[PDB]
Protein backbone atom coordinates (compact mmCIF):
# COMPACT_ATOMS: atom_id res chain seq x y z
CA UNK A 1 0.00 0.00 0.00
CA UNK A 2 2.18 3.08 0.92
CA UNK A 3 4.83 0.58 -0.08
CA UNK A 4 7.63 2.18 -2.81
CA UNK A 5 10.10 0.39 -5.84
CA UNK A 6 13.12 1.63 -5.38
CA UNK A 7 14.93 1.33 -8.84
CA UNK A 8 18.69 0.65 -8.89
CA UNK A 9 21.42 0.57 -11.66
CA UNK A 10 23.84 -2.05 -10.68
CA UNK A 11 27.10 -3.99 -12.51
CA UNK A 12 26.32 -6.99 -12.62
CA UNK A 13 29.25 -8.11 -10.16
CA UNK A 14 27.57 -6.42 -7.96
CA UNK A 15 24.20 -8.30 -8.31
CA UNK A 16 26.09 -11.55 -8.54
CA UNK A 17 28.42 -11.15 -5.32
CA UNK A 18 25.01 -9.56 -3.38
CA UNK A 19 22.82 -12.52 -4.54
CA UNK A 20 25.55 -14.94 -3.52
CA UNK A 21 25.63 -13.54 -0.40
CA UNK A 22 21.96 -13.86 0.26
CA UNK A 23 22.28 -17.67 -0.49
CA UNK A 24 23.95 -18.10 2.18
CA UNK A 25 21.81 -16.36 4.23
CA UNK A 26 18.55 -17.84 3.07
CA UNK A 27 17.50 -14.60 2.16
CA UNK A 28 15.54 -12.90 -0.47
CA UNK A 29 17.53 -10.24 -2.52
CA UNK A 30 15.56 -7.71 -1.64
CA UNK A 31 15.65 -8.34 2.18
CA UNK A 32 19.43 -8.88 2.15
CA UNK A 33 19.90 -5.23 -0.02
CA UNK A 34 17.56 -3.59 2.68
CA UNK A 35 18.04 -4.87 5.89
CA UNK A 36 22.16 -4.25 5.26
CA UNK A 37 21.59 -0.49 3.64
CA UNK A 38 19.05 0.38 6.68
CA UNK A 39 21.64 -0.97 9.16
CA UNK A 40 24.01 0.93 7.87
CA UNK A 41 21.83 3.89 7.67
CA UNK A 42 20.68 3.88 11.08
CA UNK A 43 24.28 3.84 12.01
CA UNK A 44 25.17 7.32 9.71
CA UNK A 45 22.64 9.12 11.42
CA UNK A 46 22.89 7.98 14.47
CA UNK A 47 26.84 8.86 14.02
CA UNK A 48 25.92 12.27 13.20
CA UNK A 49 23.07 12.88 15.44
CA UNK A 50 23.91 11.38 19.31
CA UNK A 51 27.88 10.00 18.51
CA UNK A 52 29.11 13.33 17.78
CA UNK A 53 32.29 13.63 19.74
CA UNK B 1 26.96 -5.48 -18.64
CA UNK B 2 25.06 -3.22 -16.42
CA UNK B 3 21.32 -4.38 -14.86
CA UNK B 4 18.32 -3.47 -13.38
CA UNK B 5 17.38 -4.35 -9.95
CA UNK B 6 13.80 -3.60 -8.32
CA UNK B 7 13.55 -3.59 -4.71
CA UNK B 8 10.06 -2.75 -3.08
CA UNK B 9 10.17 -1.37 0.08
CA UNK B 10 8.91 -0.14 3.25
CA UNK B 11 8.61 3.91 2.47
CA UNK B 12 10.29 4.23 6.35
CA UNK B 13 12.44 2.20 4.63
CA UNK B 14 12.80 4.57 1.50
CA UNK B 15 13.08 7.48 3.88
CA UNK B 16 15.99 6.44 6.07
CA UNK B 17 18.46 5.34 3.61
CA UNK B 18 17.74 8.60 2.22
CA UNK B 19 18.35 10.72 4.87
CA UNK B 20 21.98 8.44 5.11
CA UNK B 21 22.66 9.27 1.38
CA UNK B 22 22.25 12.83 1.96
CA UNK B 23 24.42 13.10 5.06
CA UNK B 24 27.22 10.99 2.81
CA UNK B 25 26.71 13.00 -0.41
CA UNK B 26 26.08 10.08 -2.32
CA UNK B 27 23.20 8.89 -4.52
CA UNK B 28 20.80 6.78 -3.16
CA UNK B 29 21.87 4.03 -5.69
CA UNK B 30 25.56 4.13 -4.65
CA UNK B 31 24.70 4.37 -0.65
CA UNK B 32 22.95 0.87 -1.27
CA UNK B 33 25.05 -1.11 -3.01
CA UNK B 34 28.11 0.27 -1.18
CA UNK B 35 26.58 -1.23 1.99
CA UNK B 36 25.30 -4.19 0.29
CA UNK B 37 28.62 -5.21 -1.16
CA UNK B 38 30.65 -4.76 1.47
CA UNK B 39 28.25 -6.60 4.10
CA UNK B 40 28.22 -9.53 0.86
CA UNK B 41 31.84 -9.71 0.97
CA UNK B 42 31.96 -9.94 4.34
CA UNK B 43 29.46 -13.21 4.70
CA UNK B 44 30.91 -15.24 1.68
CA UNK B 45 34.93 -14.93 3.55
CA UNK B 46 33.09 -16.17 7.19
CA UNK B 47 31.45 -18.66 5.11
CA UNK B 48 35.01 -19.86 3.42
CA UNK B 49 36.39 -20.33 6.64
CA UNK B 50 33.35 -22.95 7.64
CA UNK B 51 34.34 -25.00 5.00
Same mark, same amino acid.
Given at each position: ? /? *?? &??? %???? #? /? &? +???? *??? =?????? /? +? $? *??? %?? $??? &? =? =? #????? *? +? +?????
Amino acid at each position: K /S *DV &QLN %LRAK #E /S &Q +RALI *DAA =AEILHK /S +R $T *DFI %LE $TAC &Q =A =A #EKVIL *D +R +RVFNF
